[PDB]
């Protein structure tokens, strides 16, 4: 067995975009094991220690003007540049969700019908799933499994709705997503 | 509303190194440290953009030198093993005899070293399985995805066996047709 202690070091450069490239924040961070020790926040303008472990580094790096000026302009040469490079296939990537409605396999309490609205294979993750009973939105009884990121640039989610079904009622699952101009709807006819 | 992360790491004594780009949590690419080439997460990205993989190795060398300096500075304080949270799901609702994919989600763990194996009816699978590299997390722990394409049936049962230093015993997450 391998019992040797491990020593880990991570370096991350995060480009945060607001309203496209209008507002950009660059966050450079160093993490020893699970402890972030020093970082460079473009909103601050210089390296700052996050813990005592990183004090020597912030001080040393802030003494190098060439490093400091590159970091201060990186918001443009690094962040905005990379955004322009990947925008067409990342920011603008769109894959329509597959939507289907069927009753849950469980169905606990008798005179009740737990409905399931399955929404999968979509991108981006931003999505709106709502339930309606005869054209009026259902706030109560609605429960979601959450937004699941599949790791292959795809998302999925399950949004349930408990109902006291009455013949003739129409329960609609409506999905709004950037991939479509108008909402997608699937109806359960009770 | 959008975040692009260049994430790298070096780990001793495993001598493991990684360099990757992330977009809103999804990997754009990572560099193969041995072949010294860019590995795009999705085939098409390679036709829409490029990256000089060779140069990433310059960063990994600096990362290693920095790790050793920090290791000594901390008086050789080792990392605390944090066991993974493991979940198994299908990429889409399962339908009998309808092609699907089993996803083994390994999350919130560190250090970035894990052994994952798929088991179909108690026996190890290998056909068509794929996996991603370690993905970054805001808390600085890692995420990872392992995949297994399969054909649903009421007979075939599966298990995702995960080993990690933070786990006293191998963790097996079971899966089988129920719907």
């Amino acid at each position: 067995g391998d019992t040797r202690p491990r020593f880990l070091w991570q370096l991350k450069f995060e480009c945060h975009f607001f309203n496209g490239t209008e507002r950009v924040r660059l966050l450079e961070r160093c993490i020893y094991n699970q402890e972030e020790s020093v970082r460079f926040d473009s909103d601050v303008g210089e390296y700052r220690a996050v813990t005592e472990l990183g004090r020597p580094d912030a001080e040393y790096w802030n003494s190098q003007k060439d490093l400091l000026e590159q970091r201060r302009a990186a918001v443009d040469t690094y962040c905005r540049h990379n955004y322009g490079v990947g925008e067409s296939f990342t920011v603008q990537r769109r894959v329509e969700p597959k939507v289907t409605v069927y009753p849950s396999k469980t169905q606990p309490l008798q005179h009740h019908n737990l409905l399931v609205c399955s929404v999968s294979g979509f991108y981006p993750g931003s999505i709106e799933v709502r339930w309606f009973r005869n054209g009026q939105e259902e706030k109560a009884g609605v429960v979601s499994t959450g937004l699941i990121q599949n790791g292959d640039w795809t998302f999925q989610t399950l949004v349930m709705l408990e109902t006291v079904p009455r013949s003739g009622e129409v329960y609609t699952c409506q999905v709004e997503h950037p991939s479509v101009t108008s909402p997608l709807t699937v109806e359960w006819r009770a | 509303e959008h975040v692009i992360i260049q994430a790298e790491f070096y780990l001793n004594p495993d001598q493991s190194g990684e360099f990757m780009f992330d977009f809103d949590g999804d990997e754009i690419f990572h560099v193969d440290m041995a072949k010294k080439e860019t590995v795009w997460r999705l085939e098409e990205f390679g036709r829409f953009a490029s990256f000089e993989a060779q140069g990433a190795l310059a960063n990994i060398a600096v990362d290693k030198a920095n790790l050793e300096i920090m290791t000594k500075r901390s008086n050789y304080t080792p990392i605390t093993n944090v066991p993974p949270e493991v979940t198994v799901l299908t990429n889409s609702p399962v339908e009998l005899r309808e092609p699907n994919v089993l996803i083994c989600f390994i999350d919130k763990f560190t250090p970035p070293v894990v052994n994952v194996t798929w088991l179909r009816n108690g026996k190890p699978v290998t056909t068509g399985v794929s996996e991603t590299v370690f993905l970054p997390r805001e808390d600085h722990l890692f995420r990872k995805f392992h995949y297994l394409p399969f054909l649903p049936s009421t007979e075939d049962v599966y298990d995702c066996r995960v080993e990690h230093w933070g786990l006293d015993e191998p963790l097996l997450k079971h899966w089988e047709f129920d719907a």
């Binding site: 370096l11 450069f13 450079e28 020597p56 580094d57 040393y60 790096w61 490093l67 990186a74 040469t77 690094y78 540049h81 990379n82 490079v85 990947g86 | 260049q6 790298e8 360099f19 780009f21 754009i28 953009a49 490029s50 990256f51 140069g55 990433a56 310059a58 960063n59 600096v62 990362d63 030198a65 920095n66 300096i69 920090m70």
Partner: peptide
């Protein structure tokens, strides 16, 4: 894409 160079400690 372009990378940010790693700063040496």
């Amino acid at each position: 894409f372009v990378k940010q160079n790693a700063a040496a400690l």
